[PDB]
Design a binder for these strands. Structure first.
Ligand code: SJT
Ligand code: ZN
Ligand code: ZN
Ligand code: ZN
Lengths: 110, 144, 62, 325, 187, 66, 81
RNA sequence: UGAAGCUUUCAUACU
């Protein structure tokens, strides 16, 4: 547990100097919402150097039960027109999506 | 949308895969292929491995349509189930004494190799050095 | 010699007895035999002699 | 606008005739004081509680980051010929001026230098000291370096030539620092290993045990044995004459130390030989489990060595880790 | 210039994977080594069969593919309920008997202290009373001769278990002489 | 058949093994953190490990049979 | 039967007859990635022609979603010869 | 207990 009064997470460490966490979902609604965010951001905001996002996370084995939150937080850096096109499919506004993204991060990490 | 309905059609596909009629097995293989490519990234690997256990014995089939459907189903399972399982199914036949088994298994292996050549790096089994040649990959044995 | 999958397609006697000797040596080797494989240090000197087997320890403690 | 409560919790509301955004962070039991400051040359609010936080978005990157100091009671921006951009902060029986000059980082770090590549460290449960093992390939030990240098000196003094001007006494005096000029990478099966006891609050080295030339440490553990009292022990697994490519090793050893003086000193007890590299050591039910290459063994503490108690021989290739629940 | 079966069985670390034709391969040592990898299901076993695959016996008569329990409970065979069909399909969903990755299917592989209430009703045994002694007729031999050595941990009411135990059709209980909660799960 | 690394019913052990050794070395050259692992393990510069792998590319597994 | 020479910038086309079905797996469901063809197959009088029946092209040729998932869009010019 | 393959002048069904 990283923050006082927070929840337990799985912290990992990398040979390039990176630090990351994997946190569990507690409800089906959060999981479904983040799954739809990832699905819609895989198409309308593709990786910069020509890679397929689902194929990259399936490099040696297919992905199973993980949502890429580094792709999901790239929503806050898109242009307002595409932010609206993405948000209006989730039946939501961009500020609500931003608040929902910040909630799960501040629940576990900083 | 099919991710919620794979458990319901599995016994029917079992029965059809056990059916003597060529169309029954060919069409069941087509169903397996479409189901595999339909659910991908949704965690349905259990039923798909179960169904592969019934699809695989048909690799020694001479009828062209049946073997075409079997190859399609195998290439769909390569995506839905992963290349590691496919390599595990091909390993013991790659070097069989009979030329028929070797032909079939090398066709399947080449199909697995052309797609996802990079993932196979992490899946190859260990092969020991002989007197003449070195076969161990030593870098992967490093321990920081 | 018991009938197992190891002794299949083997039709000659001496081949069977030699393969049985081989399998016996292999299996007997790969087990854990505590009697000869164990390190006891008896309280005879209590700070020396850790080369005691599992039988010499009983002889010293008898 | 920001809303500070009398507790260590905060609110936020975007300026408009009606609230449009909401975000509350449980980040105190003491009243929040909101003060004006300027970070990055633009506006920011320095919230203050038992701990003092800085709230700043950053091109839509909201950050509520604490600081590495204790409670204050009033502050604002500062500017001088000394430093034109800072803060004037007040504490109990104190008048401070402070500054924050880190461009949006999440961690602050302090560093303590080591000698070789660290492999693994354990934490002493009583003293909270760290027991680290460091090991490098193509490396000399300290003694081997010293004697190799003395060798080169005595050989260059007998170069058969006027024996009248000595570069050898100048070559022996000052050692160029290895953190700047590199360590002499010499040899293919040559190793260098070290065991270190370190205090984590300060950076001081409490104890240092150097090992022989071609011994390489790979595992370390701190535990207690049931047949003994409440004494702590340190076990170090070491390879002997390891070649990596093609792989070849001459053997291995397990060292045992007693970890006395409130977890500050290691004293050698004995040294048990093994026929392969001990790569994993794990305390287990008043005893210890050791992975000796392909073999998994149970070991109890003895008076002259470690006593083998149980063994499994069916693990596939090589044991790289052991964990027990 | 080719091995015999017994000669090749002496060279390999695992002789029970060696077969008749394995000595006729171009590289039998690699073949046997790959046959011993700690994975890698074997060949479909009908490569040498001249009867091809499947077929073989038309003797067996098979009934129509039985519908799953919940679907057959939906009462499909006029007023139709949709919510019942939905809630039942999702809420009543069950997982069928799946098989392991190693397992393979063959032509002949589709054929090869507590008592039930129906057996207790047919045998003529009454129900368990509140505070009395109503043993089964096999318990008198256990009370006379002693406890069974095959199951020493079994408890019977009257001999080892007290009479007030016995509840319903449970006339016996096996008494054999942590933090088991999973880590990340939905609430 | 036109792709390098594919096999057939007459492929030998040597060709298979040198093919997987060669694309293993290329994969090591490609992935940035595998080369890091090796360069930390054997205590060498990364340029030196790259050059060693390129030099090993020529004849991995020794010269062929007969 | 496929040209399969490494392609370039020319955009493959389909005729009115089959508009909207994949060129690899000839499928009627979900198109994904635009088809590129070799320069020789688009040279001269061949520009804009159907990648299946060399007739007049009226729409852009696409690989289906299943083909792009299996990376069957990376195998070369799919003009049928 | 079991092993039902191969061929055509058959004849009959499905694509
Ligand atoms: C005779 O000409 C051919 C055979 C060759 C050709 C390429 O030259 C010609 O253009 C082509 C055109 C007509 C036909 C019959 C081919 C394609 C179409 O066929 C139809 C018969 C199917 N019907 C369906 O798709 C079923 C459902 C519907 C509504 O779709 C969808 C998406 O739900 C599949 C396909 C849409 O057919
Ligand atoms: Zn072309
Ligand atoms: Zn056309
Ligand atoms: Zn297609």
């Amino acid at each position: 547990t990283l923050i006082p009064g927070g929840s337990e997470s799985l912290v990992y460490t990398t040979l390039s100097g990176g630090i990351g966490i994997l946190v569990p979902f507690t409800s089906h609604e959060d999981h479904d919402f983040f799954q739809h965010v990832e699905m819609h951001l895989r198409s309308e905001h593709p990786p910069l150097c020509g890679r397929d996002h689902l194929s990259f996370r399936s490099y040696y084995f297919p992905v199973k039960n993980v949502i890429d939150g580094d792709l999901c937080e790239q929503f806050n850096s898109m242009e307002p027109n595409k932010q609206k096109n993405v948000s209006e499919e989730l039946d939501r506004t961009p500020p609500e999506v931003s608040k929902k993204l910040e909630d799960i991060r501040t629940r576990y990490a900083f | 949308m099919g991710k919620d309905y794979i458990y319901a059609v599995t016994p029917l596909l079992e029965d059809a895969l056990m059916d003597r009629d060529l169309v029954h097995r060919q069409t069941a293989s087509a169903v397996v292929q479409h189901m595999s490519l339909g659910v991908y990234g949704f965690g349905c690997e259990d039923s798909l491995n179960h169904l592969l256990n019934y699809v695989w014995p048909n690799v020694f089939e001479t009828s062209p349509h049946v073997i075409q459907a079997v190859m399609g189903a195998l290439e769909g399972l390569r995506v839905a189930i992963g290349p590691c399982r496919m390599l595990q199914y091909c390993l013991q036949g790659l070097f069989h004494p009979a030329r028929k088994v070797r032909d079939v298994y090398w066709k399947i292996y080449n199909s697995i190799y052309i797609g996802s050549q990079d993932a196979l790096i992490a899946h190859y089994p260990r092969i020991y050095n002989d007197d003449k040649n070195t076969y161990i990959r030593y870098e992967l044995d490093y321990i920081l | 010699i018991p009938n197992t999958a190891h002794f299949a397609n083997v039709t000659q006697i001496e081949d069977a007895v030699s393969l049985w000797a081989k399998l016996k040596l292999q299996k007997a080797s790969e087990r854990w035999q505590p009697d000869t494989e164990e390190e006891y240090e008896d309280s005879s000197g209590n700070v020396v002699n850790k080369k005691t087997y599992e039988d010499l320890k009983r002889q010293g403690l008898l | 606008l920001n809303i500070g409560l009398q507790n260590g919790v905060l609110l936020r509301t975007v300026l408009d005739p009606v609230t449009g955004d909401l975000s509350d962070t449980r980040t105190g039991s003491r009243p929040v004081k909101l003060f004006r400051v300027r970070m990055q040359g633009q506006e920011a609010v320095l919230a203050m509680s038992s701990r003092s936080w800085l709230s700043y978005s950053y091109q839509s990157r909201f950050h509520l980051t604490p600081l590495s100091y204790e409670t204050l009671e009033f502050a604002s921006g500062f500017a001088s010929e000394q430093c034109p951009e800072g803060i004037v902060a007040i504490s109990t029986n104190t008048l401070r001026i402070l500054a924050l000059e880190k461009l949006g980082a999440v961690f602050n770090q302090v560093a303590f230098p080591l000698q070789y590549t660290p492999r693994k460290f354990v934490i002493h449960p009583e003293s909270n000291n760290l027991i680290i093992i460091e090991t490098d390939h193509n490396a000399y030990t300290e003694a081997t370096k010293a004697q190799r240098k003395q060798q080169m000196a005595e050989e260059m003094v007998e170069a058969a030539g006027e024996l009248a001007a000595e570069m050898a006494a100048a070559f022996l005096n000052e050692n160029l620092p290895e953190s700047i000029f590199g360590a002499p990478k010499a040899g293919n099966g040559q190793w260098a290993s070290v065991i270190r006891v370190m205090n984590p609050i300060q950076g001081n080295t409490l104890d240092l045990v150097q090992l022989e030339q071609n011994e390489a440490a790979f595992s370390v553990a701190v535990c207690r044995f049931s047949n003994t009292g409440e004494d702590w022990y340190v076990l170090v697994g070491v390879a002997k004459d390891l070649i990596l490519n093609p792989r070849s090793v001459a053997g291995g050893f397990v060292y045992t130390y007693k970890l006395v003086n409130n977890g500050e000193k290691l004293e050698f007890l004995h040294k048990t030989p093994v026929e392969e590299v001990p790569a994993a050591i794990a305390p287990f039910q008043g005893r210890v489990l050791i992975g000796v290459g392909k073999l998994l063994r149970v070991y109890d503490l003895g008076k002259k060595k470690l006593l083998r108690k149980c063994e499994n021989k069916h693990i596939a290739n090589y044991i790289s880790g052991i964990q027990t629940i | 210039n080719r091995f015999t079966v017994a000669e090749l069985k002496q060279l390999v670390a695992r002789p029970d994977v060696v077969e008749m034709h394995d000595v006729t391969a171009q590289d039998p040592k690699l073949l046997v080594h790959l046959k011993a990898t700690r994975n890698s299901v074997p060949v479909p076993r009908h490569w040498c069969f001249k009867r091809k695959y499947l077929q073989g016996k038309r003797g067996i008569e098979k009934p129509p593919f039985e519908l799953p329990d919940f679907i057959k409970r939906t009462g499909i065979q006029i007023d139709i309920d949709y919510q019942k069909l939905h809630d039942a399909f999702f809420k009543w969903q069950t997982k069928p008997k799946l098989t392991i990755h190693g397992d393979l299917y063959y032509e002949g592989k589709e054929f090869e202290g507590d008592l039930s209430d129906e057996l207790r009703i047919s045998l003529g045994m009454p129900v368990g009373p509140n505070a009395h002694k109503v043993p089964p007729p096999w318990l008198i031999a256990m009370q006379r001769y002693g406890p069974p050595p095959s199951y020493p941990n079994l408890k019977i009411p009257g001999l080892n278990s007290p009479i007030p135990p016995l509840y319903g059709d449970v006339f016996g209980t096996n008494a054999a002489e942590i933090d088991r909660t999973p880590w990340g799960e939905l609430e | 058949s036109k792709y390098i690394g594919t096999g057939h019913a007459d492929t030998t052990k040597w060709e298979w093994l040198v093919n997987q050794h060669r694309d293993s070395y290329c994969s090591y050259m490609g992935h940035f953190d595998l080369l890091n692992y090796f360069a930390i393990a054997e205590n060498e510069s990364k340029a030196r490990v790259r050059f060693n792998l390129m030099e090993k590319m020529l004849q991995p597994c020794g010269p062929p049979a007969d | 039967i496929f040209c399969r020479k490494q392609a370039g910038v020319a955009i493959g086309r389909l005729c009115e007859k089959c508009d909207g079905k994949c060129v690899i797996c000839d499928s009627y469901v979900r198109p994904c990635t635009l088809v590129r063809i070799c320069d020789e197959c688009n040279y001269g009088s061949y520009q804009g022609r159907c990648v299946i029946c060399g007739g007049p092209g009226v729409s852009d040729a696409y690989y289906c979603k299943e083909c792009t998932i299996q990376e069957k869009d990376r195998d070369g010019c799919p003009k049928i010869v």
